[PDB]
């Protein structure tokens, strides 16, 4: 269970307890590499580095982000003060920009970053992309 500002899974502020990922291969512009899968993700994550600091809000082309079906945010990012928000993540595959979908949580944080709660993936090979733009 999570609330407006804290996640209880005891309760903590996601902006102060997340996993930091600096993985440029996650970029929506990276179409290379051996496809991997974010099946092992759990809890809250922050993305930094040249691959970008945010999930894409637009459908990503297949075979990007070092995966087969790249996953993007079927929603709009929250602002600081909006609390933890409920969103759908969509995987693009086989002509279908939401071939698979799963729930993700998003929170805006003091200091100008977002954190994402990512609980595995619905299929493999799927990954949560970052937009370097
Ligand atoms: C951070 O989150 C992890 C997993 O949710 C938990 O095991 C750990 O106790 C948390 N730490 C703090 C300080 O909240
Ligand atoms: C998700 O994407 C579809 C198609 O691109 C769009 O119609 C819908 O409004 C989007 N939902 C949100 C919450 O952004
Ligand atoms: C997010 O919203 C969906 C649709 O209302 C719901 O099924 C899901 O349980 C929500 N996630 C939560 C409350 O963590």
XYZ file of N, CA, C and O and ligand atoms in Angstrom:
574
model
N 0.829 -1.198 0.000
C 0.000 0.000 0.000
C 0.869 1.255 0.000
O 1.901 1.313 0.675
N 0.440 2.259 -0.761
C 1.135 3.534 -0.858
C 0.108 4.647 -0.699
O -1.088 4.456 -0.940
N 0.587 5.816 -0.292
C -0.284 6.956 -0.084
C 0.076 8.099 -1.008
O 0.680 7.879 -2.059
N -0.296 9.325 -0.645
C 0.001 10.454 -1.519
C 1.503 10.692 -1.620
O 2.033 10.895 -2.719
N 2.211 10.666 -0.490
C 3.642 10.939 -0.490
C 4.519 9.743 -0.155
O 5.678 9.719 -0.575
N 4.019 8.758 0.587
C 4.841 7.638 1.018
C 4.336 6.305 0.476
O 3.138 6.112 0.254
N 5.282 5.388 0.276
C 5.014 4.007 -0.095
C 5.296 3.108 1.101
O 6.330 3.252 1.757
N 4.377 2.193 1.389
C 4.487 1.283 2.530
C 4.579 -0.136 1.976
O 3.566 -0.813 1.790
N 5.806 -0.576 1.710
C 6.051 -1.893 1.154
C 7.468 -2.361 1.407
O 8.389 -1.552 1.512
N 9.571 0.090 6.869
C 8.173 0.112 6.464
C 7.962 1.296 5.502
O 8.634 1.357 4.471
N 7.053 2.225 5.799
C 6.778 3.300 4.855
C 8.008 4.185 4.681
O 8.743 4.463 5.635
N 8.225 4.642 3.451
C 9.338 5.536 3.165
C 8.948 6.497 2.053
O 8.001 6.259 1.301
N 9.688 7.592 1.966
C 9.518 8.534 0.872
C 10.305 8.025 -0.325
O 11.535 7.936 -0.246
N 9.652 7.696 -1.448
C 10.404 7.140 -2.584
C 11.527 8.037 -3.053
O 12.520 7.539 -3.592
N 11.390 9.357 -2.896
C 12.447 10.275 -3.303
C 13.724 10.093 -2.492
O 14.783 10.569 -2.916
N 13.657 9.413 -1.352
C 14.833 9.199 -0.508
C 15.253 7.740 -0.413
O 16.189 7.427 0.328
N 14.582 6.838 -1.125
C 14.949 5.422 -1.085
C 14.586 4.817 -2.439
O 13.521 4.228 -2.599
N 15.519 4.894 -3.377
C 15.333 4.367 -4.715
C 16.628 3.712 -5.173
O 17.687 3.857 -4.547
N 16.524 2.952 -6.256
C 17.681 2.362 -6.915
C 18.105 3.274 -8.049
O 17.283 3.657 -8.878
N 19.380 3.602 -8.094
C 19.919 4.508 -9.095
C 20.464 3.700 -10.252
O 21.266 2.785 -10.041
N 20.010 4.031 -11.464
C 20.444 3.368 -12.685
C 21.058 4.395 -13.626
O 20.398 5.367 -14.017
N 22.306 4.155 -14.018
C 23.017 4.921 -15.039
C 23.334 3.949 -16.167
O 24.415 3.357 -16.235
N 22.361 3.769 -17.059
C 22.425 2.747 -18.098
C 22.077 3.387 -19.433
O 20.916 3.379 -19.857
N 23.062 3.963 -20.124
C 22.775 4.575 -21.432
C 22.149 3.621 -22.431
O 21.496 4.080 -23.381
N 22.325 2.311 -22.260
C 21.721 1.379 -23.208
C 20.204 1.457 -23.181
O 19.557 0.973 -24.112
N 19.631 2.040 -22.129
C 18.192 2.203 -21.996
C 17.619 3.234 -22.953
O 16.398 3.333 -23.059
N 18.461 4.007 -23.629
C 17.987 5.134 -24.407
C 17.031 4.683 -25.504
O 17.220 3.636 -26.127
N 16.001 5.496 -25.743
C 15.112 5.262 -26.862
C 15.858 5.322 -28.188
O 15.359 4.805 -29.193
N 17.030 5.958 -28.217
C 17.810 6.071 -29.444
C 18.818 4.944 -29.619
O 19.467 4.877 -30.667
N 18.967 4.064 -28.634
C 19.866 2.915 -28.743
C 19.086 1.743 -29.347
O 18.126 1.243 -28.748
N 19.480 1.304 -30.535
C 18.842 0.146 -31.149
C 19.736 -1.085 -31.151
O 19.397 -2.081 -31.804
N 20.865 -1.049 -30.446
C 21.863 -2.108 -30.506
C 21.915 -2.867 -29.189
O 21.148 -2.612 -28.261
N 22.829 -3.830 -29.120
C 23.000 -4.632 -27.930
C 22.188 -5.918 -27.972
O 21.267 -6.090 -28.772
N 22.546 -6.837 -27.080
C 21.791 -8.072 -26.917
C 20.576 -7.793 -26.042
O 20.718 -7.332 -24.904
N 19.387 -8.066 -26.578
C 18.148 -7.723 -25.898
C 18.144 -8.285 -24.486
O 18.441 -9.463 -24.276
N 17.808 -7.434 -23.515
C 17.631 -7.869 -22.146
C 16.228 -7.569 -21.674
O 15.392 -7.117 -22.459
N 15.953 -7.815 -20.402
C 14.613 -7.690 -19.856
C 14.700 -7.170 -18.431
O 15.592 -7.557 -17.672
N 13.757 -6.293 -18.076
C 13.660 -5.692 -16.751
C 12.798 -6.528 -15.816
O 12.182 -5.992 -14.881
N 12.746 -7.846 -16.050
C 11.882 -8.708 -15.255
C 12.221 -8.674 -13.762
O 11.353 -8.940 -12.915
N 13.458 -8.378 -13.415
C 13.881 -8.405 -12.022
C 13.689 -7.078 -11.288
O 14.027 -6.981 -10.103
N 13.187 -6.042 -11.951
C 13.000 -4.769 -11.274
C 11.976 -4.875 -10.149
O 11.000 -5.614 -10.237
N 12.233 -4.159 -9.065
C 11.298 -4.112 -7.954
C 11.605 -2.851 -7.155
O 12.769 -2.488 -6.989
N 10.563 -2.188 -6.684
C 10.748 -0.968 -5.949
C 10.923 0.234 -6.859
O 10.568 0.226 -8.042
N 11.474 1.293 -6.274
C 11.580 2.592 -6.917
C 12.957 2.781 -7.551
O 13.974 2.306 -7.051
N 12.973 3.494 -8.655
C 14.159 3.682 -9.473
C 14.278 5.137 -9.890
O 13.276 5.813 -10.131
N 15.523 5.605 -9.980
C 15.864 6.860 -10.617
C 16.847 6.594 -11.746
O 17.801 5.821 -11.582
N 16.605 7.242 -12.885
C 17.425 7.103 -14.078
C 18.244 8.365 -14.277
O 17.695 9.475 -14.236
N 19.545 8.187 -14.527
C 20.463 9.291 -14.777
C 21.399 8.898 -15.910
O 21.491 7.734 -16.294
N 22.110 9.889 -16.433
C 23.143 9.651 -17.422
C 22.682 9.949 -18.831
O 21.597 10.476 -19.073
N 23.547 9.601 -19.785
C 23.313 9.994 -21.169
C 22.081 9.332 -21.773
O 21.563 9.833 -22.772
N 21.609 8.222 -21.206
C 20.409 7.596 -21.711
C 19.138 8.341 -21.392
O 18.089 7.991 -21.938
N 19.206 9.351 -20.537
C 18.056 10.149 -20.168
C 17.660 9.945 -18.714
O 18.072 8.997 -18.043
N 16.821 10.868 -18.243
C 16.394 10.918 -16.850
C 14.918 10.636 -16.688
O 14.428 10.594 -15.549
N 14.195 10.397 -17.782
C 12.767 10.155 -17.708
C 12.346 9.081 -18.699
O 12.967 8.895 -19.750
N 11.260 8.401 -18.367
C 10.630 7.513 -19.332
C 10.081 8.325 -20.495
O 9.759 9.511 -20.355
N 9.966 7.672 -21.655
C 9.334 8.302 -22.804
C 7.827 8.412 -22.594
O 7.179 7.476 -22.115
N 7.262 9.563 -22.980
C 5.817 9.738 -22.990
C 5.208 9.396 -24.345
O 4.007 9.597 -24.533
N 6.027 8.950 -25.297
C 5.600 8.614 -26.647
C 6.024 7.192 -26.978
O 7.008 6.676 -26.431
N 5.278 6.563 -27.897
C 5.581 5.193 -28.285
C 6.980 5.115 -28.893
O 7.371 5.958 -29.710
N 7.741 4.092 -28.489
C 9.115 3.901 -28.939
C 9.156 2.791 -29.981
O 8.432 1.797 -29.876
N 10.019 2.958 -30.982
C 10.178 1.946 -32.015
C 10.715 0.651 -31.420
O 11.510 0.651 -30.470
N 10.290 -0.464 -32.014
C 10.737 -1.775 -31.544
C 12.247 -1.913 -31.703
O 12.882 -1.233 -32.515
N 12.821 -2.840 -30.930
C 14.263 -3.087 -30.918
C 15.040 -1.818 -30.547
O 16.056 -1.472 -31.158
N 14.550 -1.112 -29.542
C 15.267 -0.001 -28.935
C 15.495 -0.304 -27.461
O 14.915 -1.233 -26.893
N 16.343 0.506 -26.832
C 16.541 0.441 -25.387
C 17.127 -0.895 -24.947
O 16.887 -1.348 -23.824
N 17.892 -1.531 -25.832
C 18.497 -2.836 -25.560
C 17.442 -3.873 -25.165
O 17.624 -4.644 -24.224
N 16.338 -3.911 -25.920
C 15.268 -4.860 -25.651
C 14.535 -5.129 -26.962
O 14.871 -4.567 -28.008
N 13.553 -6.024 -26.908
C 12.695 -6.282 -28.065
C 11.496 -5.333 -28.075
O 11.323 -4.547 -29.006
N 10.675 -5.377 -27.025
C 9.484 -4.536 -26.930
C 9.753 -3.410 -25.939
O 9.644 -3.620 -24.720
N 10.090 -2.207 -26.392
C 10.372 -1.116 -25.447
C 9.096 -0.617 -24.777
O 8.022 -0.561 -25.382
N 9.224 -0.233 -23.514
C 8.088 0.216 -22.730
C 8.170 1.717 -22.494
O 9.240 2.246 -22.173
N 7.020 2.382 -22.632
C 6.896 3.826 -22.516
C 5.711 4.158 -21.617
O 4.901 3.295 -21.262
N 5.655 5.421 -21.193
C 4.669 5.869 -20.213
C 3.438 6.395 -20.940
O 3.495 7.457 -21.561
N 2.324 5.664 -20.830
C 1.039 6.047 -21.426
C 0.317 7.044 -20.518
O -0.790 6.816 -20.027
N 0.989 8.170 -20.302
C 0.490 9.200 -19.407
C 1.426 10.385 -19.403
O 2.385 10.445 -20.179
N 1.126 11.341 -18.524
C 1.910 12.560 -18.379
C 2.589 12.574 -17.015
O 1.999 12.171 -16.011
N 3.830 13.011 -16.989
C 4.592 13.011 -15.740
C 3.981 13.969 -14.714
O 3.532 15.068 -15.073
N 3.978 13.604 -13.430
C 3.452 14.504 -12.401
C 4.416 15.635 -12.062
O 5.598 15.615 -12.390
N 3.862 16.661 -11.437
C 4.633 17.768 -10.889
C 4.865 17.562 -9.400
O 4.121 16.844 -8.723
N 5.895 18.234 -8.884
C 6.178 18.166 -7.455
C 4.998 18.734 -6.679
O 4.595 19.886 -6.888
N 4.452 17.923 -5.785
C 3.241 18.238 -5.060
C 2.046 17.406 -5.471
O 1.057 17.363 -4.727
N 2.109 16.738 -6.626
C 1.021 15.879 -7.074
C 0.998 14.540 -6.351
O 0.029 13.784 -6.510
N 2.043 14.220 -5.586
C 2.116 12.958 -4.889
C 2.447 11.805 -5.811
O 2.833 11.990 -6.968
N 2.338 10.594 -5.260
C 2.544 9.380 -6.041
C 1.357 9.188 -6.974
O 0.198 9.227 -6.545
N 1.638 8.964 -8.255
C 0.595 8.866 -9.269
C 0.593 7.491 -9.928
O 1.637 6.853 -10.081
N -0.610 7.053 -10.289
C -0.897 5.765 -10.905
C -0.893 5.906 -12.426
O -1.617 6.740 -12.983
N -0.072 5.094 -13.096
C 0.066 5.190 -14.538
C 0.110 3.813 -15.187
O 0.378 2.793 -14.542
N -0.164 3.801 -16.492
C -0.003 2.610 -17.313
C 1.273 2.726 -18.133
O 1.500 3.744 -18.785
N 2.087 1.680 -18.120
C 3.213 1.538 -19.037
C 2.818 0.579 -20.155
O 2.171 -0.437 -19.897
N 3.211 0.906 -21.388
C 2.858 0.163 -22.588
C 4.110 -0.318 -23.303
O 5.089 0.422 -23.422
N 4.060 -1.545 -23.815
C 5.148 -2.112 -24.596
C 4.751 -2.141 -26.062
O 3.685 -2.656 -26.408
N 5.619 -1.611 -26.923
C 5.403 -1.636 -28.365
C 5.944 -2.941 -28.939
O 7.127 -3.256 -28.765
N 5.088 -3.673 -29.658
C 5.485 -4.906 -30.330
C 4.508 -5.178 -31.464
O 3.325 -4.855 -31.370
N 5.030 -5.750 -32.541
C 4.204 -6.281 -33.632
C 3.084 -5.318 -34.027
O 1.901 -5.664 -34.020
N 3.469 -4.086 -34.349
C 2.536 -3.094 -34.847
C 1.582 -2.530 -33.824
O 0.598 -1.880 -34.201
N 1.828 -2.755 -32.541
C 0.861 -2.461 -31.495
C 1.619 -1.745 -30.387
O 2.464 -2.355 -29.725
N 1.325 -0.453 -30.189
C 2.095 0.343 -29.231
C 1.765 0.035 -27.771
O 2.401 0.600 -26.860
N 0.771 -0.798 -27.515
C 0.502 -1.300 -26.172
C 0.235 -2.813 -26.215
O -0.727 -3.327 -25.639
N 1.124 -3.547 -26.893
C 0.988 -5.000 -26.992
C 0.934 -5.647 -25.618
O 0.104 -6.537 -25.383
N 1.808 -5.213 -24.699
C 1.715 -5.533 -23.284
C 1.601 -4.226 -22.504
O 2.094 -3.180 -22.938
N 0.948 -4.284 -21.350
C 0.881 -3.135 -20.459
C 1.055 -3.584 -19.008
O 0.807 -4.736 -18.646
N 1.499 -2.652 -18.174
C 1.609 -2.906 -16.748
C 1.540 -1.581 -16.006
O 1.807 -0.517 -16.563
N 1.196 -1.666 -14.732
C 1.097 -0.491 -13.891
C 2.476 -0.041 -13.425
O 3.321 -0.855 -13.047
N 2.693 1.272 -13.451
C 3.861 1.894 -12.840
C 3.395 3.086 -12.022
O 2.399 3.736 -12.355
N 4.115 3.356 -10.937
C 3.902 4.556 -10.141
C 4.996 5.559 -10.463
O 6.124 5.180 -10.767
N 4.650 6.848 -10.402
C 5.589 7.927 -10.686
C 5.429 9.012 -9.631
O 4.308 9.360 -9.246
N 6.551 9.552 -9.179
C 6.548 10.657 -8.229
C 7.597 11.679 -8.631
O 8.735 11.327 -8.950
N 7.208 12.948 -8.587
C 8.146 14.044 -8.734
C 8.822 14.318 -7.396
O 8.221 14.167 -6.323
N 10.084 14.701 -7.461
C 10.870 14.807 -6.235
C 11.538 16.160 -6.092
O 11.884 16.796 -7.087
N 11.781 16.611 -4.863
C 12.602 17.815 -4.685
C 13.991 17.629 -5.283
O 14.666 16.624 -5.050
N 14.442 18.635 -6.005
C 15.683 18.562 -6.741
C 15.547 18.336 -8.220
O 16.573 18.260 -8.906
N 14.326 18.225 -8.733
C 14.116 18.201 -10.160
C 14.268 16.856 -10.820
O 14.686 16.794 -11.982
N 13.908 15.778 -10.137
C 13.912 14.449 -10.738
C 12.618 13.732 -10.398
O 11.879 14.152 -9.498
N 12.341 12.659 -11.157
C 11.240 11.752 -10.887
C 11.805 10.406 -10.448
O 12.900 10.022 -10.857
N 11.027 9.679 -9.649
C 11.272 8.275 -9.356
C 10.108 7.441 -9.910
O 8.977 7.918 -10.102
N 10.426 6.198 -10.252
C 9.478 5.271 -10.868
C 9.440 3.984 -10.063
O 10.497 3.413 -9.774
N 8.243 3.511 -9.717
C 8.092 2.190 -9.113
C 7.799 1.187 -10.230
O 6.748 1.261 -10.879
N 8.734 0.268 -10.461
C 8.686 -0.690 -11.554
C 8.737 -2.085 -10.943
O 9.673 -2.423 -10.205
N 7.714 -2.876 -11.220
C 7.543 -4.199 -10.641
C 7.639 -5.195 -11.787
O 6.629 -5.570 -12.391
N 8.870 -5.600 -12.095
C 9.080 -6.567 -13.134
C 8.578 -6.056 -14.483
O 8.403 -4.868 -14.723
N 8.337 -7.006 -15.370
C 7.753 -6.748 -16.673
C 6.668 -7.794 -16.928
O 6.697 -8.882 -16.346
N 5.714 -7.489 -17.809
C 4.683 -8.489 -18.128
C 5.155 -9.586 -19.071
O 4.492 -10.625 -19.156
N 6.289 -9.404 -19.743
C 6.803 -10.350 -20.723
C 8.287 -10.027 -20.876
O 8.783 -9.050 -20.318
N 8.998 -10.877 -21.597
C 10.369 -10.607 -22.001
C 10.503 -10.894 -23.489
O 9.796 -11.747 -24.015
N 11.399 -10.181 -24.174
C 12.273 -9.191 -23.586
C 11.678 -7.806 -23.657
O 11.463 -7.309 -24.745
N 11.444 -7.198 -22.486
C 10.876 -5.861 -22.356
C 11.739 -5.048 -21.409
O 12.305 -5.590 -20.459
N 11.837 -3.745 -21.675
C 12.565 -2.826 -20.811
C 11.861 -1.480 -20.751
O 11.193 -1.068 -21.703
N 12.057 -0.786 -19.631
C 11.571 0.576 -19.455
C 12.602 1.531 -20.029
O 13.706 1.658 -19.481
N 12.237 2.219 -21.108
C 13.167 3.079 -21.823
C 13.344 4.417 -21.106
O 12.527 4.835 -20.282
N 14.411 5.108 -21.468
C 14.645 6.477 -21.047
C 14.804 7.328 -22.293
O 15.379 6.876 -23.289
N 14.296 8.560 -22.228
C 14.310 9.461 -23.365
C 15.476 10.425 -23.205
O 15.453 11.258 -22.292
N 16.505 10.366 -24.054
C 17.656 11.261 -23.877
C 17.391 12.684 -24.319
O 18.240 13.552 -24.083
N 16.264 12.947 -24.975
C 15.923 14.294 -25.416
C 15.795 15.243 -24.233
O 14.835 15.156 -23.460
C 14.224 1.168 1.308
O 13.399 0.252 0.594
C 13.793 -1.119 0.762
C 12.893 -1.938 -0.132
O 11.599 -1.358 -0.215
C 13.697 -1.517 2.233
O 14.180 -2.848 2.392
C 14.521 -0.565 3.092
O 14.327 -0.855 4.474
C 14.126 0.883 2.807
N 14.952 1.799 3.577
C 14.465 2.893 4.169
C 15.455 3.722 4.930
O 13.276 3.206 4.083
C -2.372 6.382 -23.939
O -2.088 6.367 -25.341
C -3.271 6.396 -26.162
C -2.818 6.253 -27.594
O -1.575 6.896 -27.837
C -4.068 7.675 -25.908
O -5.274 7.634 -26.666
C -4.397 7.808 -24.429
O -4.980 9.088 -24.194
C -3.123 7.669 -23.577
N -3.454 7.701 -22.163
C -2.912 8.574 -21.307
C -3.382 8.479 -19.892
O -2.069 9.392 -21.657
C -3.967 1.951 -10.237
O -5.223 2.145 -10.904
C -5.837 0.949 -11.412
C -7.120 1.380 -12.082
O -7.962 2.075 -11.172
C -6.067 -0.047 -10.278
O -6.555 -1.264 -10.833
C -4.774 -0.299 -9.512
O -5.029 -1.153 -8.402
C -4.159 1.020 -9.043
N -2.893 0.773 -8.369
C -2.693 0.932 -7.054
C -3.867 1.416 -6.252
O -1.612 0.693 -6.536
